[PDB]
C-alpha cells in the first residue's frame, strides 16, 4: 500500500526530492512529505525501481519462510501476494499478517537480490524437488482444459463415401478462430498440423528418422485443441505431451522441467501455466447445488438387510450366550461392512459429470470419504475413550441428522481440536531442540579425498524378473556423489567416478542393470572440522554441488523439524 | 402465537408445537 | 473533461507487433481490448479459396494417382495459400504440371486481378509420369466461414468445399497492465499483439479496424449532439 | 496530549471533570478531561466477512459495479464465493440457506387448483402463498425438507419482465462483465445473510521508519499506538543463517536496533549521497561487558 | 535461448555463476563495485578519477548495484580471491 | 447477543477452580449427561476448550445449584401436557422419550417401537407403554447463540461451533435489515437482551422525538423515556436508539418502542442480505478470498461507526501543579488554532 | 545454554581464551557470523576493472 | 449482402429498447458489453456535494423536533436526484417549520437546476423544532468519496457528503442470432437501458457513443 511505502521510504524520498529541487532544505522536504503534496508520488515511484524488500510471515518456520520480493505500489491497505508462494509460508488468505523489512546498505541490497530472491528458491530444501507448483484451483482448470470427451461438436470423422473427412485444421490459429466462432469445442478429438512443437520421441524417431526436429518442420498430430493450447505454454524444445493432466502428471512434468532446465525458465513457465489455469478454471462450470449431491438409489434395501442382520445378532445376544464385548465387536464389524458397501454403491451411482466427482478425482482437494459422508453414510464415530460407539448414524448431512447423532458426533471434533492444540507445541519444542543440537556444522574444505563410502542397494534384481526399482531410491541414493564408477558388466563405463547422480543418471544406471553401488557419503567425511563439500554432494535449493562456507546444520535442522506438525500417534508419533 | 404484542409477522415451517414458551433468558 | 490524452505506442518485429495504448481510464482496458480484438479478427475483408476439384479422383476416400501426398494433405497445403483478389465475382484458377518434380504456388497461372503473395510455397511433389489438374475458385469475404456453411452448392462430380479463411489476420492477443498517472495508480495499459499474413501490415490492419469501429459508433454518436474529452 | 498514530475523524463531545465543581476525582488529581473521536469506516480491502455457517474470508478485491457478472435481466451480483471450499469443509447447509433465501426473496405461489402436491402435504396452510421480500423462519431440527425446497423452487413468481431467472435446480445463466459473453454452464445464485467481523484492516496496518526510542533499553518502542517497530524473533535469525546472509543479519542486530551513533551516521548518510558506514559495537555487548566486569571477572578483549 | 526476462532478475543468475566461482563470492564481488561506483558519483562534482565510472553506459537513473551486475555479466572486471 | 452470551456464560476456571495445566484433558470432552443442561457446540476456539459452556435454552437452576430440564411424564403411553423439572439423578432413574418421535393428536403413540435414551450412552427401542418421560422440544440442548443458525442439522460440529463463535463478533452497522431466513428465537433473544426499551402499561403515544418519547398511560399519568444517542459502547462501537412508533397509536404493554444496535423492528439483525454467486473467478476468490461489488461501498451497505476515547489529567506534583492552558511554549499559532480559550 | 555460573567460573579459573568461532557466540557479540558471506575467504576481495576496459573505457 | 448497421428506438414509459442489426457473426456480444461498460460509469451528471445545517456543528448529533438524527437524513438525502446546467457550485435552500412532513418538493432551487422527484420523504418534524438546511450542487462524473471536502479547510458548519453522479440505473442486452447456412448469418442486438429520469435514454446513449468515438479516434490515424 502506498500509505505504507511512502512512510517506509521517507529518507530516500526526501533525498531524491531535495536533489530534484522540489524543496530547499531537508526540513522543508520532510514537512512536505508529511503533508503528502502531489509532488512526492513521482519521486516515490522513481526511487523504488529495483529496491528489494523482505517479507516474513509470523512465525517463520523453515528457510523458505523469509522471501525477498520486488515492491509494487497498489491502493488499499492489504499487502498483495502471489498465489504460488502461499504454500511456502503455509499461509491461508484469512487474516494472516506478515512483517515487511527493508535492507538499507548497498550490501544487503545485493544479498537480498541474489540469495533471498523468491524466483531462485522453487526447490524445497527437504528434497531436491520443486514446491511452488499449481496447488489447489488452477489444477482443476488444467484438468478441464486437457480432458478429452467423445462425440463432441466438430470432432474428427472419417471419409464417408461422397463426403470428405472433417476435423483437420491447417494450424492452431485456424482452430482457435473456429472455436471462437462456435463450431469447435475446446476439448475434442482433432487432427491439427503443428509446426513449432517437437513431436514425441516415438514419432520423432520415426517420421523424421532421427534426423532431428527443428522449427519449421510440419507433422500431422492427433490430439485435442486443449492439449495443444496447454503445450504451447511449455518451454520451446520440450517434447509434446499428449495425456490427461492429473495432479501426479503435473508433478512429474514439473519435476522433469526442473531437472532438465534452468530455474528461471521453470519459474516463467510456472507463472504462465498458473495464469492459463486461472483463466480456464472459471469456465470449467464447477459449482454446488442440491441436484449435484445425489442420494444413492437403493441404499434403503442395503440398510434394511444390514439392520436385519444386526437384529439377528441382537437376538443372539438376547439368548445370553455372548457377552457385551462380543456384541460390540459384531456390531462394529457389521456396520463397517455396511458402510463399505454403501460407499461402493454411492461410487457406482455418480456419473463423471458431478462437480464433486470432478474435484475429488482430479486431485484438486479432498478424498472420497468426505463425499461419502456428505452423500452416503457418516458411519460410526469416535468416542472420548477412542473406541467406536455401538450406535451408528444412518443419515448423511444432505438428508439431515438428528439431535442424538449430532451429540454423539461432537466428540470427534473436540478431540481433534485438542490433538492439534497439543501437536503444535510438541512440534515447536522438538524443532527448537533439533536446531539447538547441531548449530556448528559448516562445510570448510572442498574435498577430504577419503575413500570410505557407504554402500547402498540401488535396486534389487528379482529372481524371476530382470530388475525391480527400490521403493526408496528417491531418498537414499538420488543426490549423493558417486564414490566409484559403476562400470557395467563389460568394460564400458556408464557413470564415471565423482559424477553426481541424478534423474537421467539414475535412469541410465537402471538401464545398465546395476544393483549394488558404492556412494560417497558425509557420514564418513575425513574433514577435521565440518564436512568436505564433495562428501556432502549435490545441494537441494541450488541444484548443484554445495559451495564452500554454506551452513548445512541449520538447513538440516529446519528440514527435519518442519514436518513435526503432522506427527501424531510403543508410540509411533513425534514422541 | 406471537407472545409479544407487535412483533413482525413471519410464518414458519412449524410441524410440532412447544407446550411452553422460552423462559426469561 | 479533457483528462489526459491516450497515445498509441508501437513495437516492430519481423511480421508481429506489440501495439501499446497508455494511459486509459480505470476499467476501459478490457472495454477497448475485447472489442478491438474481435474487430481485427473478424472485420477486415479478404480473399481465400472456397472449393477445389480433381478430375483424377472420383471422391475423397482415396488419393490422387501418381502423387506422394494425400488428398487431405493437398487440401491443407492449398488452404494456407495466401490469395489477394480485387474482383467480387468468384474467379477460377488452374494448376497443371507433368513429369517428376515439385509444385509451387507461383506456378499456378493467375487470371486478371487475383494474385498470390507467396510463390515459393510448397504444395506437393510428383513422381515420374505424374499429373494433376485442379480448378479452385476464389471469393472475397470477411472473417472465418467453415465449409459446412457451403455444403449445399448445386450438383457436381467432385466438388470438395474447404474451410476458407476470409481474413488477412489470423492471431490476436492482448492483456492489461496497471499504471500510475497519479495517486490513483490504477490506470490500465492495453498491450495488443497481432500477427497478420503477408497480404497486410499489422498497422494498416489496426487502422482499418479502428476505421470500421469508429464508423460503427458513428451511429450511436449521431442520435444526438454531445461532447466529451479527447 | 496528541492524537495517536493512525486515528482520525470528528470530535463529537468533550467531558471535563473539575474539583472546583465538587466532582469526585481520584486522589491527587485536579482536572481530568476526556475527548471522544468518532470515525465512520466504510468496508474496504483486508476486511473480514463470514456467514452464519462459519465460513470466514477476506475482501480480495472490490471490482467496479460495471465489471461484476449480471443476471439475464441486468441485475449485477454483489459478492462471489469460491466453490472448492464447500465440499471439503462439508458445510452444505449454506447452499440450502441460499436457495431458501432466493425462494423467499422472489416470492412463490404453489399450485393448488388440482390439489396440494404430495410434497406439500405437511406445509402450513398459510405458507402456500408468499409475497416479494417475504420473511421465513426454519426452527433448528425442524424445518423445510429437501422435497419442500424442490417444490418451492419450481413455483417462484416471475420477474416483472415476465420471465423466471433461476431453474428448478436453482442455477442460472450469467453474462461475463469483461468478455461480455455468457458462461458455458449455469451457476448458483441467491441471497445469503452476511455479517461483519471486528478484525478490521485499519487497526492492523502500521509502518515505522524512525521514531521515539526507549530510554532504558535503547530500543524502539513497540505497538501501533506508540509508533514502534516490529519484533524480530530468533527463528528469523535461524532463517538468515540458513541462507548464509551475513551483512543483513549484522545490520538487523546492530545498526537498526541498538547502536546510537550508528543510527545517527547511517541516517545522515542516507539523507546525503554517502555510503552507509559499517555498523559499530552494539549497546548490548558493551552493557554485557560493563556488567560482567562487576563480578571481579577481568574480561579482556585481546584485539591482537 | 529463452524469452528475455523483465525486472530485477535481468541478467539471470546462472549466467553470472559461469563467471564467479560461487554465488557467495559474487555478492561481494558486485557490492564492492557498486560501492566504487557510488563513490565515483559522489566525487563527480570534483576530484580524482581513480574510481573509473561505469563501464557499460547506464540507463535513466539506475541503481549502482544494477550497473555493477549488468557489467559483471559483460566480463569487464577482475578480482583477487580471499586475501 | 454477545452481552447475553456473556451473561449466560458458564466458566470452569479461575479462583477456587482447577488450573489449565493440572486440569485433565478428559474433562474437556462431552458427557452423556450434558444433554439439556450445557450446550456441546458453543465453546471458545482457543486453549480454553471445554472449560467454558453455556446454559441450554430451557435449563433452570434449582435452588441448591443442580441444573434441571423440563419434561412431560407419560403415565400410560399418553403424553401429558403438564410438565415437571428433573435433575440429573432423577433423570437417570427414569425413561426419557424422544421429542421428534411422531405422536398422534390424541396422545397415542403411532409407532409401537420408539427410540429412547437410557442410563448412559445406551439407546434402544422399547414398547410404547413402559416409556415414562418425553422431552419438550427438539431444541432443548442447543445454546442461545447456536439456536439461531438455520439448517444446523446439516453442518458439521466444528463448522457449527465456528459459526456460533463468529456470530458473537458482529459489528453494528448504520442501516440494519432483518434476515430473510432465521429461526423463531430472534425477537425473543432481543427483547430479553435489555438493549431495547418497551412500554410497561398499555397507553397511547402523544408525541415522539428523535431524542425522547412521551407515552400517556390510560390512568392519566404521563411518562417519558430518554434514549441515549451516540454513546461509546464498552468495546468501542456505537450504540443508538430510533423509535419505530408513530404519533397517535395506542401501544399495548410489552410492545417494543425503540430499536437498539443490531435490531430491526424489535428483532436481531447482525448483517445484511447480499446476492451471492458460487464460482471460481480469475483466482481473486482463491483459498477463501472474497470479491465485493463497489455498489456496497458506494451505498453504505456495510458502513460502520467506531468511536475512540482519549483522556488526559493534570495531577499535582512536589515541584508544582500542572494546569491545562491554551498557551504553550514555543508553538506556532497555526498548531494551536483549534484549541479554545480554556 | 545452561548452568551459567559453574561454566563461567570454570572458564575464568583456566583463563580459557577462545577465538570467535561458531555462530551463536559470534551473533551474541554482533560480529559477522563466520558462515556464508562471512568467511575470510570472501570478506577480503579486491575488484577493479580489467585493464582492457580502462584502455578502451574512453 | 453487405450493409452498414442502423440503430432504431422502441419506446416505453421510462426504459427504452434499442435494436441494432445486421451485425457480423460473433460480434454482437462484445459490442453490447462495451456499450454497457461505457454507459454505467462514464455518463456525466450532478448530485449534492456538501450540506450545511443551521445550529449543528457536525453529523454525529441530532436536532430537536425531528424524528431521526442527522445520519438518517443524510442517507435519505443521498437518494435526491438533481440536474445541473451551470458548471459551478450552486446553492439551494430548505426551510420548513411546524408540524407535518418535509419532502423533496420543499427545496427552492436557484436558476439553472431542478429537482425531478418531489415525492421523496426526507424526514418529519414535531411542532417544537424547525429546520433550515443549505446544500451545494456540483457537476461531476463517476463517484467521489465524501472526504474531498475534508481537506478544503472550511469552517465547522460544513458537513461533507458522498457524491454519486450517475443517471443510469440498469442495462441489459440479448442477442437474436440467425445461424442459417445462408449468407444472412448475422445477429440482432437488443439493448435496454433505464435512467433515473434526470436525462432521457437517448441523451445518455449519445454521450456514451461520443465518448467511445473520441476514444477510438486515436487508432484511425495512420501509424
Ligand atoms: Mg489463517
Ligand atoms: Zn569428506
Author numbering:
A (entry chain D): 444 to 1012, 1024 to 1029
B (entry chain C): 29 to 53
C (entry chain B): 3 to 232
D (entry chain C): 837 to 1140
E (entry chain E): 28 to 110
F (entry chain C): 446 to 787
G (entry chain D): 1226 to 1283
H (entry chain A): 4 to 226
Can you quote the paper on this entry?
In bacteria, transcription is carried out by the RNA polymerase (RNAP) core (E) composed of five subunits (α_2_ββ’ω). To initiate transcription, the core associates with the promoter-specific initiation factor σ (the σ subunit) to form the RNAP holoenzyme (Eσ). Most Mtb genes are transcribed by RNAP harboring the principal σ^A^ subunit and the principal-like σ^B^ subunit that belong to group I and group II, respectively, and share almost identical promoter binding regions. Here, we show that the stress-response σ^B^ factor from the human pathogen, *Mycobacterium tuberculosis*, induces the RNAP holoenzyme oligomerization into a supramolecular complex composed of eight RNAP units.
Analysis of the *C*_1_-map showed that the RNAP-oligomer was formed by eight Eσ^B^ units assembled into an octamer that exhibited a pseudo dihedral *(D_4_)* symmetry. The Eσ^B^ octamer structure was formed by two stacked rings, related by 2-fold symmetry. Each ring was made of four Eσ^B^ units, related by 4-fold symmetry, in “head-to-tail” orientation ([Fig fig1]). The “head” included the RNAP pincers, formed by β and β’ subunits ([Fig fig1], in cyan and pink respectively), and the “tail” comprised two α subunits (**[Fig fig1],** in orange/yellow). The ring diameter was ~275 Å and the stack height was ~248 Å. The junction between rings was formed by the σ^B^ subunit domain 2 (σ^B^2, aa 23-158) that interacted with the β’ clamp (aa 1-413) and β flap (aa 808-832) (**[Fig fig1], boxed region**). The β clamp contacts were formed by the Actinobacteria-specific insertion in the β’ subunit (β’i1, aa 141-230) and invariant residues of the β’ Zn^2+^ binding domain (β’ZBD, aa 60-81). Thus we concluded that the σ2/β’ clamp junction between rings forms a rigid scaffold to hold the whole complex together. The 3D variability analysis demonstrated that the RNAP protomers underwent concerted movements relative to the scaffold, which explained the low resolution in the peripheral zones of the Eσ^B^ octamer (**Video 1**).
